[PDB]
Every structure is written in structure tokens, then in C-alpha cells.
A paper describes a structure:
Rspo (R-spondin, also roof plate-specific spondin) proteins are evolutionarily conserved from fish to humans and have well-documented roles in a broad range of developmental and physiological processes resulting from enhancement of canonical and non-canonical Wnt signalling. [name]/[name] specifically targets these Wnt receptors for ubiquitination and turnover, hence reducing Wnt signalling responses.
By using a combination of heavy atom and molecular-replacement-based phasing strategies, we determined multiple crystal structures for Xenopus (x) Rspo2Fu1–Fu2 (highest resolution 2.2 Å), xZNRF3ecto, zebrafish (z) ZNRF3ecto and mouse (m) ZNRF3ecto, (highest resolutions 2.4, 1.6 and 2.0 Å, respectively), plus complexes comprising xZNRF3ecto–xRspo2Fu1–Fu2, mZNRF3ecto–mRspo2Fu1–Fu2, mZNRF3ecto–xRspo2Fu1–Fu2 and xRNF4F3ecto–xRspo2Fu1–Fu2 (at 2.1, 2.8, 2.4 and 2.7 Å, respectively). The ZNRF3ecto crystal structures revealed a distinctive variant of the protease-associated domain topology. Two β-sheets (comprising β2, β1, β7, β3 and β4, β5, β6 strands, respectively) splay apart, accommodating an α-helix (αC) at the open edge; two additional α-helices (αA and αB) pack against the β4, β5 and β6 face of this distorted β-sandwich. A disulphide bridge, conserved across species, links two structurally elaborate loops, β3–β4 and β4–αA. The resultant single-domain structure is relatively compact. The crystal structures for apo xZNRF3ecto, zZNRF3ecto and mZNRF3ecto showed no major differences in the main chain conformation. All but two of these crystal structures reveal an extensive interface (average interface area 992±109 Å2) formed between two ZNRF3ecto polypeptide chains. The interaction is twofold symmetric; strands β3 and β7 of the ‘subunits’ abut face-to-face at the core of the dimer. The β1–β2 hairpin forms a second interface by reaching out to embrace helix αA and the β3–β4 loop in the opposing subunit.
Numbering used by the authors:
A (entry chain B): 30 to 80, 88 to 181
B (entry chain A): 30 to 80, 87 to 181
The structure:
């Protein structure tokens, strides 16, 4: 099922009102996690960063070439789990560089997380990084329709 | 339609992890805002307080006054919802227990709906909501369309 991800940039206009810009993106809900909507501020994690942020962040993790990390500290599902335990309301992996991560997550072996675990690639990941990379405050609204 | 609201208390466990306690509550989405999901930190707002910056993305909770308490209200209850979004609310949850007439007003159809959810809660759920909000600091609201 498709995860409709809205990524919102924001600047507090001087008087308290917010100026925002929204970009709508898409990934899929993995079997590894729940298929629910979720939302919160984006934290960009390095994939090795998962071996205190305020509760309810949306982890964004750009996975790396499998041959960069030969004996990885955890499985990609393990990494997501650790994120949640550390207060993530959702995890979005950019699997552009680790396309086999997908089959690994959808392997349906452990029963799922109660939070979403979304995978993104191609154009949408590029845009997700285009935004994340440049702006401190960005918000993710992950929507199951 | 029903708004399925999970309120989550939380505090850090001594090792980086979070200990949490979750409470599932219900309200309805009103025609004044979308019927979508939304999540964020609760900010309890006095109803007269929509007439100081908050981190974008908060879920405002507003317990409405007995109508005879506010004779000259700065805004319609939809106006306060709308003002809250503009100040970075991701959703508004009104406790309507003391002002049941606000429901009919919120569902009026007259103005465009907000792109954010505007939920109302009453009776028991709202009690349970304020029970958590008034005591607990560090409360996250997850509002869910199913």
C-alpha cells in the first residue's frame, strides 16, 4: 500500500504566523511496520547512527551501498525498531542505494511494528533529500488513504 | 465520522529510550476541517487565548466556555480553529462539553473546510483527555481516520 508523504517546510513569519511550503511524495508501507498515518518533525539519521530527540520524530535514513556496511550492527528492521524505542513515530528509509533492503523489510518474519516503516526510492527520495538536506525544521505527514 | 485519538504520555527512560503510556479516546471530525490524520504535541489553549510562538505542528486542545461566560467572543469557534492553524497547529481538538451548540456551528457547511482536522470531544472522552493534559506534561496526540 502507498504511503502518501507530505513534507512541509516552515518559517515562523515575524508575528507568530507560519509560512509553509508543501511537497507531496510517495513511498510504500512495508510489512515490517504498521500501515497507519503518522506525523512529526524529521530527523535525518545516518544508518550507522542506530547502533535524546523529542518523542514523535519521523526518522529519515538513507541506506547505503550494502558493501559499505559488511557486518551491519542491526538488520534494517532492527534499525527501525531502535528508532522507535528512541521515540520515532515513523521511519522512512531511502532504499535507493540498497534496493534489496525492501525484500528484507517485507519478509514478514517478526510481527510488525505498531508504527509505520516506509520505503522510498527514485525521484521521490531525491526530493525528500533535496528538502531535508537544506532545512532545519521540516515536518513529515505520512498518510494512509 | 469518528476521530480515533491516541494520547501518549512519555518521559525518557534512563538509557535513551522512551517509556510511554497510551490512552485511546474518541471524538468526531467536524465539517469545518478535513477528515484526515494528524499528530503532534498537545498544547492546551484557553478559548480566549485565540484573540507567543509555538513550534509548528502542535495539536491544540481547547475546552470551550459556557456560552453565557463569553458574550462578545472575538471569533467564531471555526475562526479560532483557523487562527490556531495559522499559528502552526496541525489539528484542533475542541472539548464541547460546556457548549454543545458549538457542534452545530462547526458543521455549518458555510465556509470552506480547513485542510487540517478539527475534532470535537465530549462527555467521557474529553474528561479522560483533560485528565491527561492538565497533569501530564509531555503529551502527544495522534488523530486517526480509519
Amino acid at each position: 500500500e502507498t504511503a502518501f508523504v507530505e513534507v512541509v517546510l516552515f518559517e515562523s513569519s515575524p508575528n507568530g504566523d507560519y509560512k509553509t511550503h508543501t511537497t507531496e511524495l510517495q513511498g510504500r508501507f512495508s510489512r515490517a511496520g504498521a500501515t497507519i498515518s503518522a506525523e512529526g518533525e524529521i530527523v535525518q539519521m545516518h544508518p550507522l547512527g542506530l547502533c535524546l530527540y523529542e518523542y514523535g520524530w519521523v526518522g529519515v535514513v538513507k541506506l547505503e551501498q550494502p558493501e559499505m556496511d559488511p557486518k551491519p550492527c542491526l538488520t534494517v528492521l532492527g534499525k527501525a525498531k531502535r528508532a522507535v524505542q528512541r521515540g520515532a513515530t515513523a521511519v522512512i528509509f531511502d532504499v535507493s542505494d540498497n534496493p534489496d533492503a525492501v525484500e528484507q523489510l517485507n519478509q514478514g518474519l517478526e510481527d510488525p511494528l505498531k508504527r509505520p516503516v516506509v520505503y522510498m526510492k527514485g525521484m521521490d527520495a531525491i526530493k525528500l533529500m533535496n528538502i531535508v538536506n537544506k532545512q532545519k525544521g521540516a515536518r513529515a505527514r505520512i498518510q494512509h488513504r
